[PDB]
Coordinates of C-alpha atoms and ligand atoms in Angstrom, one line a residue:
Chain S
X1 CA 132.9 -34.3 -26.2
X2 CA 132.0 -37.7 -27.6
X3 CA 129.7 -36.6 -30.4
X4 CA 132.9 -34.0 -31.9
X5 CA 135.1 -36.6 -31.4
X6 CA 137.5 -36.9 -34.9
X7 CA 137.8 -41.0 -34.5
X8 CA 133.9 -41.5 -35.5
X9 CA 132.5 -41.4 -38.7
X10 CA 130.5 -38.7 -40.4
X11 CA 127.9 -39.2 -41.8
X12 CA 127.1 -37.2 -45.1
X13 CA 123.1 -38.0 -45.4
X14 CA 122.3 -36.9 -42.1
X15 CA 123.1 -32.8 -42.9
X16 CA 119.8 -30.9 -43.1
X17 CA 117.7 -34.0 -42.5
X18 CA 114.9 -33.7 -40.2
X19 CA 114.7 -35.7 -36.8
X20 CA 112.4 -35.8 -34.1
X21 CA 113.6 -37.5 -30.7
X22 CA 111.3 -38.1 -27.6
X23 CA 112.8 -37.5 -24.4
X24 CA 115.3 -35.7 -25.5
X25 CA 116.3 -33.5 -22.5
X26 CA 118.8 -36.0 -20.9
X27 CA 119.8 -39.5 -20.7
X28 CA 120.7 -41.1 -23.9
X29 CA 118.0 -38.9 -25.6
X30 CA 120.0 -36.0 -24.9
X31 CA 122.6 -38.0 -26.0
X32 CA 120.8 -38.7 -29.3
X33 CA 120.1 -34.9 -29.9
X34 CA 124.0 -33.6 -29.3
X35 CA 125.0 -36.8 -32.0
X36 CA 122.6 -35.7 -34.7
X37 CA 123.3 -32.0 -34.1
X38 CA 127.1 -32.3 -34.7
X39 CA 126.0 -34.3 -37.8
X40 CA 124.6 -31.5 -39.2
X41 CA 120.9 -32.5 -38.7
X42 CA 118.0 -30.4 -38.5
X43 CA 117.0 -31.9 -34.7
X44 CA 113.6 -31.5 -32.7
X45 CA 113.1 -33.2 -29.5
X46 CA 110.1 -32.8 -27.1
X47 CA 110.6 -33.7 -23.2
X48 CA 109.0 -32.7 -20.0
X49 CA 111.9 -31.6 -18.4
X50 CA 112.1 -27.8 -19.5
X51 CA 115.4 -26.6 -17.5
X52 CA 117.7 -29.7 -19.0
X53 CA 116.3 -29.4 -22.7
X54 CA 116.8 -25.6 -23.1
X55 CA 120.4 -25.7 -21.5
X56 CA 121.1 -28.8 -24.1
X57 CA 119.8 -26.9 -26.8
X58 CA 121.9 -23.7 -26.0
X59 CA 124.9 -25.8 -25.6
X60 CA 124.0 -26.7 -29.4
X61 CA 123.4 -23.5 -31.1
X62 CA 126.5 -23.4 -32.8
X63 CA 125.4 -26.7 -34.9
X64 CA 124.5 -26.2 -38.0
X65 CA 120.6 -26.3 -36.7
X66 CA 119.8 -25.5 -33.3
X67 CA 117.7 -28.0 -32.1
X68 CA 114.2 -27.5 -31.5
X69 CA 112.5 -28.3 -28.2
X70 CA 108.7 -28.7 -27.2
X71 CA 107.7 -29.4 -24.3
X72 CA 104.9 -32.2 -23.7
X73 CA 103.9 -34.8 -21.9
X74 CA 104.3 -38.3 -23.8
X75 CA 101.2 -39.9 -22.0
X76 CA 98.7 -37.3 -23.3
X77 CA 98.6 -38.6 -26.8
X78 CA 96.4 -35.3 -27.6
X79 CA 99.4 -33.2 -26.2
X80 CA 102.1 -35.1 -28.2
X81 CA 100.5 -35.1 -31.8
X82 CA 100.2 -31.2 -31.3
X83 CA 104.0 -30.9 -30.1
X84 CA 105.0 -32.9 -33.1
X85 CA 102.7 -31.0 -35.8
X86 CA 104.5 -28.1 -34.0
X87 CA 108.0 -29.3 -34.4
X88 CA 106.8 -30.3 -37.9
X89 CA 105.9 -27.0 -39.3
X90 CA 109.7 -25.4 -37.4
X91 CA 111.9 -28.2 -39.4
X92 CA 109.7 -29.9 -42.3
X93 CA 108.8 -33.3 -42.8
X94 CA 110.1 -36.0 -40.6
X95 CA 112.5 -38.3 -41.9
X96 CA 113.3 -40.2 -38.9
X97 CA 112.5 -40.7 -35.4
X98 CA 113.8 -41.8 -32.4
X99 CA 111.1 -42.9 -29.8
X100 CA 114.0 -43.0 -26.6
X101 CA 111.1 -42.0 -23.8
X102 CA 110.3 -44.0 -20.8
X103 CA 110.6 -44.4 -17.3
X104 CA 111.7 -47.4 -15.1
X105 CA 110.4 -47.0 -11.9
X106 CA 110.6 -50.0 -9.5
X107 CA 107.3 -51.6 -8.9
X108 CA 106.2 -54.7 -6.8
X109 CA 103.8 -57.2 -8.6
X110 CA 101.3 -57.2 -5.4
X111 CA 101.3 -53.2 -5.6
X112 CA 100.1 -52.9 -9.2
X113 CA 97.0 -51.1 -9.8
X114 CA 95.0 -51.3 -13.1
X115 CA 95.9 -47.3 -12.7
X116 CA 99.5 -48.1 -12.5
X117 CA 99.5 -50.4 -15.0
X118 CA 98.0 -48.1 -17.4
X119 CA 100.9 -45.2 -16.9
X120 CA 103.1 -47.5 -17.2
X121 CA 102.2 -48.9 -20.7
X122 CA 101.8 -45.0 -21.4
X123 CA 105.1 -44.0 -20.5
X124 CA 107.2 -47.1 -21.9
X125 CA 105.2 -48.2 -25.1
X126 CA 102.0 -46.0 -26.1
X127 CA 104.0 -42.9 -27.4
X128 CA 106.0 -45.0 -29.6
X129 CA 103.1 -46.1 -31.5
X130 CA 101.5 -42.8 -31.6
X131 CA 104.5 -40.9 -32.4
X132 CA 105.2 -43.2 -35.1
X133 CA 101.7 -43.2 -36.3
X134 CA 102.0 -39.2 -36.4
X135 CA 105.0 -39.1 -39.4
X136 CA 104.9 -41.8 -41.3
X137 CA 103.0 -39.6 -43.9
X138 CA 106.0 -37.7 -44.2
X139 CA 108.0 -40.2 -44.6
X140 CA 106.0 -42.0 -47.3
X141 CA 106.3 -38.7 -49.2
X142 CA 109.6 -38.3 -48.4
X143 CA 110.1 -41.7 -50.2
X144 CA 111.3 -43.3 -47.1
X145 CA 112.6 -43.1 -44.0
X146 CA 113.8 -44.6 -41.0
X147 CA 112.1 -45.2 -36.9
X148 CA 114.1 -46.4 -33.8
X149 CA 112.2 -47.7 -31.2
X150 CA 114.3 -48.2 -27.7
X151 CA 114.3 -51.4 -26.2
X152 CA 115.7 -52.7 -22.9
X153 CA 117.6 -56.0 -22.0
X154 CA 116.2 -55.5 -18.8
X155 CA 113.4 -58.5 -20.1
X156 CA 116.1 -60.3 -21.8
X157 CA 117.9 -60.8 -18.4
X158 CA 114.5 -61.3 -16.8
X159 CA 115.2 -58.7 -14.2
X160 CA 113.0 -58.8 -11.2
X161 CA 111.3 -55.1 -9.7
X162 CA 109.5 -53.8 -12.7
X163 CA 107.4 -56.8 -14.4
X164 CA 105.1 -54.0 -16.3
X165 CA 108.2 -52.4 -17.5
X166 CA 109.7 -55.4 -18.6
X167 CA 106.0 -56.7 -20.7
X168 CA 106.0 -52.8 -22.1
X169 CA 109.8 -52.8 -23.2
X170 CA 109.7 -56.6 -24.9
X171 CA 106.2 -55.0 -26.4
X172 CA 108.5 -52.9 -28.4
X173 CA 109.6 -56.2 -30.3
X174 CA 106.1 -56.5 -31.6
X175 CA 105.3 -53.4 -32.2
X176 CA 108.2 -52.8 -34.4
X177 CA 107.9 -56.0 -36.6
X178 CA 104.7 -55.0 -37.3
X179 CA 105.4 -51.8 -38.2
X180 CA 108.3 -52.9 -40.1
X181 CA 106.2 -55.6 -42.4
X182 CA 103.6 -52.3 -43.3
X183 CA 106.0 -49.9 -44.0
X184 CA 108.6 -51.5 -45.6
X185 CA 106.7 -51.0 -48.6
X186 CA 107.3 -47.8 -48.4
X187 CA 110.9 -47.5 -47.6
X188 CA 110.2 -46.9 -44.2
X189 CA 112.6 -48.6 -42.0
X190 CA 111.5 -49.7 -38.4
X191 CA 114.1 -51.2 -35.7
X192 CA 114.3 -51.6 -32.0
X193 CA 117.7 -50.1 -30.6
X194 CA 118.4 -52.0 -27.4
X195 CA 121.2 -50.6 -24.6
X196 CA 123.0 -52.4 -21.8
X197 CA 123.4 -51.0 -18.7
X198 CA 124.3 -47.1 -20.1
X199 CA 126.3 -44.8 -17.8
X200 CA 123.9 -41.8 -18.3
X201 CA 124.7 -39.0 -15.8
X202 CA 121.4 -40.0 -13.6
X203 CA 122.7 -44.0 -13.5
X204 CA 126.4 -42.5 -12.4
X205 CA 125.0 -40.0 -9.8
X206 CA 121.9 -42.6 -8.4
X207 CA 122.6 -45.9 -8.9
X208 CA 126.3 -47.1 -9.7
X209 CA 128.3 -48.5 -7.0
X210 CA 130.5 -51.1 -6.3
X211 CA 127.9 -54.1 -6.4
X212 CA 126.8 -52.1 -9.5
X213 CA 130.3 -52.4 -11.7
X214 CA 130.8 -56.1 -10.6
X215 CA 127.6 -56.9 -12.0
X216 CA 128.7 -55.2 -15.2
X217 CA 131.7 -57.0 -15.4
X218 CA 130.3 -60.0 -15.0
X219 CA 127.8 -59.7 -16.9
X220 CA 129.2 -57.6 -20.2
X221 CA 132.2 -59.6 -22.3
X222 CA 134.1 -55.9 -22.3
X223 CA 135.0 -55.0 -19.1
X224 CA 134.5 -51.1 -19.9
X225 CA 131.9 -48.7 -19.4
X226 CA 128.8 -48.4 -21.9
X227 CA 128.2 -44.7 -23.0
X228 CA 125.2 -42.6 -24.5
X229 CA 128.0 -42.1 -27.4
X230 CA 127.9 -45.9 -28.2
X231 CA 124.1 -45.8 -28.6
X232 CA 123.9 -42.5 -30.3
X233 CA 126.5 -43.9 -32.9
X234 CA 124.1 -47.0 -33.3
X235 CA 121.2 -44.5 -34.3
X236 CA 123.0 -42.5 -36.6
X237 CA 123.9 -45.5 -38.8
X238 CA 120.2 -46.6 -38.5
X239 CA 119.0 -43.2 -39.3
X240 CA 121.3 -42.5 -42.2
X241 CA 121.3 -44.0 -45.8
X242 CA 124.0 -46.9 -44.6
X243 CA 121.1 -48.7 -43.4
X244 CA 119.1 -48.9 -46.2
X245 CA 118.1 -52.3 -45.7
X246 CA 118.1 -52.8 -42.1
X247 CA 114.6 -53.0 -40.9
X248 CA 112.9 -55.5 -38.2
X249 CA 115.7 -55.9 -36.3
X250 CA 116.4 -55.6 -32.6
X251 CA 120.1 -53.9 -32.8
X252 CA 121.7 -54.7 -29.2
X253 CA 124.5 -52.4 -27.7
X254 CA 125.5 -53.7 -24.6
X255 CA 129.1 -54.7 -24.6
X256 CA 127.7 -58.9 -24.8
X257 CA 125.8 -58.9 -21.6
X258 CA 122.1 -60.1 -22.7
Chain V
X1 CA 130.2 -47.8 -57.6
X2 CA 128.9 -48.0 -54.0
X3 CA 132.0 -47.9 -51.9
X4 CA 132.8 -44.4 -53.1
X5 CA 129.3 -43.0 -53.3
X6 CA 129.7 -39.4 -51.5
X7 CA 126.2 -40.5 -49.4
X8 CA 127.5 -42.9 -47.2
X9 CA 129.7 -42.9 -44.0
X10 CA 133.4 -42.1 -43.8
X11 CA 135.0 -44.1 -40.7
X12 CA 138.5 -42.2 -39.9
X13 CA 139.2 -44.8 -37.6
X14 CA 139.6 -47.2 -40.8
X15 CA 142.3 -45.6 -42.4
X16 CA 145.6 -47.4 -42.5
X17 CA 144.1 -50.5 -40.2
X18 CA 144.9 -53.6 -41.1
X19 CA 141.8 -55.7 -42.8
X20 CA 142.1 -59.0 -43.4
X21 CA 139.0 -60.9 -45.3
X22 CA 138.6 -64.3 -46.6
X23 CA 137.2 -65.3 -49.5
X24 CA 137.5 -61.6 -50.9
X25 CA 137.8 -62.4 -54.4
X26 CA 134.3 -62.5 -55.6
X27 CA 130.8 -62.2 -54.5
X28 CA 130.2 -60.1 -50.9
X29 CA 133.7 -60.8 -50.0
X30 CA 135.0 -58.8 -53.1
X31 CA 132.2 -55.8 -51.8
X32 CA 134.3 -56.1 -48.5
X33 CA 137.5 -55.5 -49.8
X34 CA 136.2 -52.6 -51.9
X35 CA 134.9 -50.3 -49.1
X36 CA 137.6 -51.2 -46.9
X37 CA 139.6 -50.1 -49.7
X38 CA 137.7 -47.2 -50.5
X39 CA 137.4 -46.1 -47.0
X40 CA 141.5 -46.1 -46.9
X41 CA 142.3 -49.8 -44.9
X42 CA 145.4 -51.6 -45.3
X43 CA 143.4 -54.7 -46.9
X44 CA 144.8 -58.0 -47.5
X45 CA 142.6 -60.8 -48.9
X46 CA 142.9 -65.0 -49.3
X47 CA 140.5 -67.0 -52.0
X48 CA 141.4 -69.7 -54.5
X49 CA 140.1 -67.8 -57.2
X50 CA 143.2 -66.1 -58.5
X51 CA 141.9 -64.5 -61.7
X52 CA 139.3 -62.7 -60.0
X53 CA 141.7 -61.9 -57.0
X54 CA 143.9 -60.4 -59.2
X55 CA 141.6 -58.4 -61.0
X56 CA 139.8 -57.0 -57.9
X57 CA 143.3 -56.2 -56.5
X58 CA 144.3 -54.2 -59.7
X59 CA 141.3 -52.6 -59.8
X60 CA 141.3 -51.1 -56.5
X61 CA 145.2 -50.3 -57.4
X62 CA 144.4 -46.8 -56.9
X63 CA 143.3 -46.7 -53.2
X64 CA 145.5 -45.3 -50.4
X65 CA 146.9 -49.1 -50.4
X66 CA 146.3 -51.8 -52.7
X67 CA 144.7 -54.6 -51.0
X68 CA 147.6 -57.8 -51.2
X69 CA 146.2 -60.8 -52.0
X70 CA 148.0 -64.6 -51.4
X71 CA 146.0 -67.4 -52.8
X72 CA 145.3 -70.3 -50.6
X73 CA 142.8 -73.2 -49.9
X74 CA 140.9 -72.5 -46.7
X75 CA 140.1 -75.8 -45.9
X76 CA 143.8 -76.7 -45.4
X77 CA 144.7 -75.0 -42.5
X78 CA 148.5 -75.2 -42.9
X79 CA 148.0 -73.6 -46.2
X80 CA 145.3 -71.0 -44.5
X81 CA 147.9 -69.8 -41.5
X82 CA 150.7 -69.7 -44.0
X83 CA 148.9 -67.1 -45.9
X84 CA 147.8 -65.0 -42.9
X85 CA 151.5 -64.9 -42.2
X86 CA 152.5 -63.8 -45.6
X87 CA 149.9 -61.2 -45.1
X88 CA 151.1 -60.4 -42.0
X89 CA 154.8 -60.0 -43.1
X90 CA 153.5 -57.7 -45.6
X91 CA 150.8 -55.3 -43.6
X92 CA 151.6 -56.0 -40.0
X93 CA 149.7 -57.0 -37.0
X94 CA 145.9 -57.6 -38.4
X95 CA 143.4 -55.2 -36.3
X96 CA 140.1 -56.5 -38.0
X97 CA 139.5 -60.0 -39.4
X98 CA 136.2 -60.6 -41.8
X99 CA 135.5 -64.2 -41.9
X100 CA 133.5 -64.3 -45.1
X101 CA 134.2 -67.3 -47.2
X102 CA 131.9 -70.4 -47.5
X103 CA 130.4 -72.7 -49.8
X104 CA 126.6 -73.5 -50.2
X105 CA 126.5 -75.9 -52.5
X106 CA 123.2 -78.3 -52.5
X107 CA 123.3 -81.7 -51.1
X108 CA 120.6 -84.4 -50.2
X109 CA 120.4 -85.9 -46.7
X110 CA 121.1 -89.1 -48.3
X111 CA 123.9 -88.3 -50.4
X112 CA 126.4 -86.9 -47.3
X113 CA 128.9 -88.8 -46.6
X114 CA 131.4 -88.8 -43.8
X115 CA 134.4 -86.8 -46.2
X116 CA 131.6 -84.5 -47.6
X117 CA 130.1 -83.9 -44.0
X118 CA 133.6 -82.6 -43.5
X119 CA 134.8 -81.1 -46.5
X120 CA 131.2 -78.9 -46.1
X121 CA 132.5 -78.2 -42.1
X122 CA 135.7 -77.5 -43.2
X123 CA 135.0 -74.7 -46.0
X124 CA 131.5 -73.2 -44.1
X125 CA 132.9 -73.2 -40.6
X126 CA 136.5 -74.5 -39.7
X127 CA 138.5 -71.9 -41.6
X128 CA 136.4 -69.2 -39.2
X129 CA 137.7 -70.7 -35.9
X130 CA 141.4 -71.1 -37.0
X131 CA 141.5 -67.5 -38.9
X132 CA 140.6 -66.2 -35.6
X133 CA 143.1 -68.4 -33.5
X134 CA 145.8 -66.9 -36.2
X135 CA 144.9 -63.0 -35.5
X136 CA 144.0 -63.0 -31.9
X137 CA 147.9 -62.3 -30.4
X138 CA 147.9 -59.5 -32.9
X139 CA 144.5 -57.9 -31.2
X140 CA 145.8 -58.7 -28.1
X141 CA 149.1 -56.8 -28.6
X142 CA 147.2 -53.9 -30.9
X143 CA 144.9 -53.1 -27.3
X144 CA 142.1 -54.6 -29.1
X145 CA 140.0 -55.7 -32.6
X146 CA 137.1 -56.6 -34.5
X147 CA 136.1 -60.4 -35.8
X148 CA 133.1 -60.5 -38.1
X149 CA 132.2 -63.8 -38.8
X150 CA 130.1 -64.4 -41.4
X151 CA 126.3 -66.4 -40.6
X152 CA 123.4 -66.7 -42.8
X153 CA 119.4 -66.9 -42.6
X154 CA 119.4 -69.7 -44.3
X155 CA 118.7 -72.1 -41.2
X156 CA 116.7 -69.3 -39.4
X157 CA 114.2 -69.7 -42.4
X158 CA 114.7 -73.6 -42.1
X159 CA 115.6 -73.6 -45.6
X160 CA 115.7 -77.1 -47.1
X161 CA 118.4 -78.2 -49.6
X162 CA 121.7 -78.2 -47.7
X163 CA 121.2 -79.6 -44.3
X164 CA 125.1 -79.3 -43.3
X165 CA 125.6 -76.0 -44.8
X166 CA 122.9 -75.0 -42.3
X167 CA 124.2 -76.8 -39.2
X168 CA 127.7 -74.9 -40.3
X169 CA 126.2 -71.6 -40.6
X170 CA 124.2 -72.1 -37.5
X171 CA 127.7 -72.9 -35.6
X172 CA 128.9 -69.5 -36.4
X173 CA 126.6 -68.5 -33.5
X174 CA 128.2 -70.6 -30.8
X175 CA 131.7 -69.3 -32.4
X176 CA 131.0 -65.8 -32.1
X177 CA 130.0 -66.1 -28.6
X178 CA 132.2 -67.9 -27.2
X179 CA 135.3 -66.4 -28.5
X180 CA 133.3 -62.9 -27.5
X181 CA 133.6 -63.8 -23.9
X182 CA 136.8 -65.2 -23.9
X183 CA 138.4 -62.3 -26.1
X184 CA 136.2 -59.1 -24.7
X185 CA 139.0 -58.7 -21.7
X186 CA 141.5 -57.9 -24.5
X187 CA 139.0 -55.5 -26.0
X188 CA 138.2 -57.7 -28.9
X189 CA 134.8 -57.8 -30.4
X190 CA 133.2 -60.3 -32.0
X191 CA 130.1 -60.5 -33.7
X192 CA 128.3 -62.2 -36.4
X193 CA 127.3 -60.5 -39.7
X194 CA 124.3 -62.2 -40.7
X195 CA 123.1 -61.2 -44.9
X196 CA 120.0 -61.9 -46.3
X197 CA 120.1 -62.9 -50.1
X198 CA 122.3 -60.9 -51.7
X199 CA 122.3 -60.2 -55.3
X200 CA 125.5 -61.1 -55.9
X201 CA 127.0 -62.0 -59.6
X202 CA 126.8 -65.6 -58.7
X203 CA 123.4 -65.3 -57.6
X204 CA 121.9 -64.1 -60.1
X205 CA 123.3 -65.8 -62.8
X206 CA 122.7 -69.4 -60.8
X207 CA 120.0 -69.0 -58.6
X208 CA 117.4 -66.1 -59.1
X209 CA 114.6 -67.0 -61.2
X210 CA 111.0 -65.8 -61.2
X211 CA 110.2 -68.1 -57.9
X212 CA 113.1 -66.6 -56.3
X213 CA 112.1 -63.2 -57.0
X214 CA 108.3 -64.3 -55.8
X215 CA 109.9 -65.8 -52.2
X216 CA 112.4 -62.5 -51.9
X217 CA 109.5 -60.0 -52.4
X218 CA 107.0 -61.9 -49.8
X219 CA 110.1 -62.4 -47.2
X220 CA 111.6 -59.4 -47.0
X221 CA 109.9 -56.2 -45.7
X222 CA 111.6 -53.8 -48.1
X223 CA 110.7 -54.8 -51.5
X224 CA 114.2 -54.2 -52.8
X225 CA 117.3 -55.9 -53.7
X226 CA 119.4 -56.6 -51.0
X227 CA 123.4 -55.9 -52.3
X228 CA 126.5 -56.4 -51.5
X229 CA 127.4 -52.9 -50.3
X230 CA 124.5 -53.2 -47.8
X231 CA 126.8 -56.0 -46.2
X232 CA 129.7 -54.2 -46.5
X233 CA 128.6 -50.9 -45.2
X234 CA 127.6 -52.7 -41.6
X235 CA 130.9 -54.5 -41.7
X236 CA 133.3 -51.2 -42.0
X237 CA 131.2 -50.1 -39.0
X238 CA 131.7 -53.2 -37.2
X239 CA 135.4 -52.8 -37.7
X240 CA 135.7 -49.2 -37.1
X241 CA 136.7 -47.6 -33.7
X242 CA 132.2 -46.7 -33.7
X243 CA 131.3 -50.1 -32.5
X244 CA 133.5 -50.3 -29.3
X245 CA 131.1 -52.0 -27.6
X246 CA 129.0 -53.8 -29.8
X247 CA 130.0 -57.8 -29.5
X248 CA 128.7 -61.0 -29.4
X249 CA 125.8 -60.2 -31.4
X250 CA 124.0 -61.7 -34.7
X251 CA 123.8 -58.4 -37.4
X252 CA 121.4 -59.1 -39.5
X253 CA 121.5 -57.0 -42.7
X254 CA 118.3 -58.9 -44.7
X255 CA 115.9 -56.2 -46.0
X256 CA 113.5 -57.9 -42.8
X257 CA 113.3 -61.4 -43.6
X258 CA 114.3 -63.6 -41.4
Ligands
NAI1 N1 121.0 -48.0 -18.5 C1 119.7 -47.4 -19.4 O1 120.1 -46.6 -19.1 C2 118.9 -48.1 -20.0 C3 118.6 -47.5 -21.1 N2 117.1 -48.4 -21.6 C4 116.2 -47.3 -22.5 O2 117.2 -46.2 -23.5 C5 116.0 -45.6 -23.8 C6 117.0 -43.9 -22.6 O3 117.3 -44.6 -21.5 P1 117.7 -43.2 -20.1 O4 118.4 -42.2 -20.8 O5 118.5 -44.0 -19.2 O6 116.0 -42.7 -19.5 P2 115.9 -41.4 -18.2 O7 114.7 -42.3 -17.3 O8 117.4 -41.2 -17.8 O9 115.2 -40.4 -19.3 C7 114.3 -40.7 -19.8 C8 114.2 -39.0 -20.7 O10 112.7 -38.8 -21.3 C9 111.8 -37.6 -20.5 N3 110.5 -38.6 -20.0 C10 110.1 -39.4 -19.1 N4 108.8 -39.4 -19.2 C11 108.3 -38.5 -19.8 C12 106.7 -38.2 -20.4 N5 105.6 -38.4 -20.2 N6 106.6 -37.2 -20.8 C13 107.8 -36.4 -21.7 N7 109.3 -37.1 -21.7 C14 109.0 -38.1 -20.4 C15 112.4 -37.9 -19.8 O11 112.5 -36.5 -18.8 C16 114.2 -38.4 -19.9 O12 114.5 -37.2 -20.3 C17 115.0 -45.6 -22.5 O13 113.9 -45.8 -23.6 C18 115.5 -46.8 -21.7 O14 114.1 -47.8 -21.6 C19 117.3 -49.4 -21.5 C20 118.2 -50.8 -21.4 C21 119.3 -49.6 -20.6
NAI2 N1 125.2 -63.8 -51.0 C1 123.7 -64.4 -50.5 O1 122.9 -64.6 -50.9 C2 124.2 -65.2 -48.6 C3 126.0 -65.1 -48.5 N2 125.8 -65.6 -46.9 C4 127.1 -65.9 -46.5 O2 128.3 -64.6 -47.2 C5 129.2 -64.6 -47.4 C6 129.7 -64.3 -48.8 O3 128.5 -65.1 -49.4 P1 128.9 -65.3 -51.3 O4 129.5 -64.1 -51.6 O5 127.4 -65.5 -52.0 O6 129.5 -66.7 -51.2 P2 130.4 -67.1 -52.7 O7 130.5 -68.9 -53.0 O8 129.6 -66.5 -53.7 O9 131.9 -66.6 -52.4 C7 132.6 -67.3 -51.6 C8 134.3 -66.3 -52.3 O10 135.3 -67.4 -51.1 C9 136.1 -68.0 -51.8 N3 136.1 -69.5 -51.4 C10 135.0 -70.6 -51.0 N4 135.9 -71.5 -51.2 C11 136.8 -71.5 -50.7 C12 138.3 -72.0 -50.0 N5 138.7 -73.8 -49.8 N6 139.2 -71.7 -50.3 C13 139.2 -70.1 -50.9 N7 138.3 -69.6 -50.8 C14 137.1 -70.3 -51.1 C15 135.4 -68.0 -53.2 O11 136.2 -68.2 -54.0 C16 134.7 -67.3 -53.0 O12 135.6 -65.9 -53.9 C17 129.1 -66.5 -46.7 O13 129.9 -66.8 -45.7 C18 127.8 -66.6 -47.0 O14 127.7 -68.1 -46.0 C19 124.6 -66.2 -46.0 C20 123.5 -66.0 -46.5 C21 122.9 -65.7 -47.9

């Protein structure tokens, strides 16, 4: 598996490091969970998909630390805070946070309601703020930390089909930069990690067809598949000591598309 | 030494890899040489500064491969190509290129002449194109490669004091993006690596005073010194297999300033 490929880096500073990943049960989040666990980190993740989450954690029980799973709905901030506190009691103070969960469900401009606007913000942006809010004091006490906010090239390409989603993901830029200014005095880096079109299992099974492949080939500079591992490795570097002075950045891993 | 600090990553794919660095005798270039040497790469570098270059190579003579040095003035394209060919004859096809050499000497708008304009472009931009031109066939034949072009945050901050330098450094964006598009079909990544104000020896002795220290602290999000190793570790990642789908980027390592 890509997270155990011997050609790729090993990051000694991740061993035993407490790492929290949201939306970790499937897709890129699952790749984050697997990569960090195989680096020796003490992983925990939250998600609504319990069956996928339990199977992921069981796959990774031979890691140095079996990943901790707590189920919660990230649109419920009280539940999110309760889950993080429960996680802290099991893995100790949080040293790295990957704000990954999202929902890119399509919506036409004419159909958006105030409630559906709010739901999109809640699932794509709001939880990134409150997850970070809940971990700052741990990272301050540790003498530093790393927060990785998942962005998107969707709004950079000016994709139609989901204008509130594009707004929510562009908003991550402002979130990252505002947190980076305030938290940098404490050794806390905050960065936006921006994926291109990643071939998650869901994207392969539901959305990749001939026109998709042709769009990828014309857009990307490199005619190859962007994989979850390409994003996971970048997150490892951003959470490791190796990137101590990288903060407030939009770190794009997309084959040269956007 | 930062390049041998056990807390940082080891990149297995760099072992034995032929890596060429321009302006590698001092400052950040020397840190590039040192880092790639300590990762086990087969390093070669060019520079005008022969005394510093021989000392740097001799000091790294206990690495897996002693870095190869060939002297040249990179503003002379024939000398640059000949130096690269001398290097190829010793370490074989080039797998990775770090285009680092530069000269940021200050100049009043009113004092620039046609010749002084051309020399600024020659030492700051032109050699990046031609060193890239001289390694592309190697990278094609190897099935891929990585070209790292050194940019600057100076033009991003709109610094006064050296307008042709600022032009040359902004020009690296177009160079990187144009090559990335043309060379991506061959598995060649091209990225701009953008340092902040890095505390090289030359920067401390010549440019860092109380004024500079105040600007750094107000500008950077993280109130700590940016060091050459911060940039070198990013270059290691960009040249290693771990960054196979990162191309056409402006990779900024600057403590959150620009
Ligand atoms: N081609 C791609 O996959 C793209 C990825 N991104 C971003 O990368 C990150 C992950 O991408 P994907 O894996 O493709 O997303 P995905 O939709 O396939 O998976 C999201 C995961 O978060 C969980 N999730 C969704 N809503 C939740 C909620 N209220 N509460 C708890 N968990 C919830 C989900 O169960 C899921 O496991 C996202 O932030 C996405 O916006 C953006 C650019 C392209
Ligand atoms: N150190 C900093 O604060 C910043 C660095 N940069 C960029 O990072 C890269 C390295 O920066 P520094 O180490 O500070 O530069 P530097 O001026 O201290 O060293 C440049 C090295 O290249 C060699 N060099 C200069 N002209 C040459 C020529 N015709 N022929 C052969 N060799 C030549 C020099 O001998 C030197 O060893 C540069 O491309 C620079 O523009 C940009 C942002 C700030």
